[PDB]
């Protein structure tokens with residue numbers, strides 16, 4: 202009992218494993234319908250783009266997914282549900298590179314793009330539906346796990362500070378490897394906050410935002426990489442949403458680039474679409490000559 | 504030679520005072536036309552609002568202004584221009600309370616307001632035109648002054664830090680008088696920047712923004728007024744615009760109030776309309792539970 206947009210994540214308990222069958226049967230009815238919607242998206246692409254060999258390949262993954270899914274017989278016991286999980290697992294892996302295949306197929310296809318609002322809409326709808334589908338699927342699998350402080354993929358006691366720190370260490374390493382240093386990150390605000398929340402969207406978004414804030418900081422301090430401005434992260438936790446402000450002193454996004462930056466890495470426009478999909482937002486405040494403030498808002502689970 | 508939107512401020516030099524006659528004759532043709540546009544605005548008000556005695560009074564100031572202006576004969580020498588200045592001076596003073604009279608007339612008139620986009624449009628158009636008219640008029644008068652680092656109302660060497668500091672001292676005093684203390688203000692970024700710029704819009708806007716940031720800070724620290732979070736102002740100066748970010752730790756503007764706050768003190772919605780009128784913007788980022796960031800952008804003079 203809990204939801205993403207129009208999709209339900211099951212918070213349940215059954216010592217017989219009754220909840221696993223109910224969740225399995227839900228996932229089994231919901232997946233094919235949503236995969237078919239993805240097939241329609243490909244069908245309605247401008248012909249010339251839909252013809253691109255990589256776009257066509259991704260199109261074919263979805264048909265294949267829909268075939269295997271609809272071919273699976275209904276679930277009438279635990280044993281069915283178990284094998285169904287195996288299928289779902291295989292599909293999640295087969296589809297792991299999809300975002301990357303799309304970004305490539307569409308680049309090969311840049312010249313033939315006449316209407317950009319049309320393709321941008323396709324990407325947003327595809328990528329965000331894909332996310333929802335993957336959360337729902339991953340949730341069901343994670344219900345088989347016995348891990349504490351987790352109901353499926355819902356973490357019952359999530360520390361925004363903690364999950365930010367993990368992605369900071371990650372982004373710092375990439376940055377140190379490329380520039381030989383990385384900005385110290387400071388975290389302020391509600392650093393002690395804990396509340397139920399689904400990690401996954403944060404796991405996509407944060408590393409992107411952290412990579413940008415760090416890149417921009419280094420690219421504008423080439424002369425002094427051993428000494429660069431800190432990246433300052435602020436956490437604001439209230440009853441409606443969680444806000445994570447990420448501020449860098451990297452010189453800002455230039456006026457001429459302001460529009461190009463939020464459109465299709467490819468990490469920012471995806472991140473914004475994810476945030477809105479979940480009922481939040483991703484906004485940018487550029488101080489040209491100084492730095493950039495990025496505001497990630499995500500609604501509280503309920 | 505220099506401009507606000509569709510209006511020209513004259514940067515000129517004449518030892519005979521030839522520039523004063525050219526500016527005077529420009530101001531004399533431009534004022535009546537723009538006052539008449541203000542009269543149309545009142546004429547097109549919903550009857551029931553336009554009937555309010557205070558709204559009617561302001562309406563009558565404008566007609567009166569337009570009469571005295573059109574009655575003034577053309578300017579053919581320095582002596583005419585001098586008396587014209589006297590008239591313009593008198594009008595600027597007669598009209599000094601207009602914003603306040605409007606805000607009052609419309610409050611008396613709240614119940615009868617059916618379409619809010621209509622009135623909001625009237626206010627924006629009136630208040631922002633009024634500003635432009637007052638800049639143009641004040642500029643002409645200031646051309647009579649011999650003050651250094653000033654061509655009329657254009658300051659040739661304006662320090663954003665300096666003008667911010669003046670409004671900080673001002674807002675601090677009001678705040679100390681009401682709460683018995685006030686937040687320390689810190690200024691960072693391009694604190695050494697200097698460039699031609701027209702002070703006036705900053706003189707309206709900054710004190711409003713500073714009053715809010717300080718009020719919000721005190722209202723959320725009632726227990727400890729002797730010790731409150733600093734207000735942090737950041738100046739970003741580039742070739743396109745000037746950005747002044749004003750950040751407070753006053754708990755943010757609550758979700759439920761987010762829309763009500765930018766609509767018609769009355770200081771924020773005016774400030775935003777002024778900023779856009781001049782080709783800039785005024786945007787708010789609320790971190791509910793923590794504070795608010797306000798971003799004032801104003802285009803560089805050119």
Ligand SMILES: CC(C)C[C@H](Cl)C(=O)O
Pocket residue numbers: 236266292293296297299330331332334335338
């Ligand atoms: C069959 C599903 C799980 C595939 C999802 Cl929609 C994805 O593209 O990864």
Ligand SMILES: CC(C)C[C@H](Cl)C(=O)O
Pocket residue numbers: 538568594595598599601632633634636637640
């Ligand atoms: C006649 C002019 C100078 C009046 C201006 Cl538009 C104002 O209302 O103050």
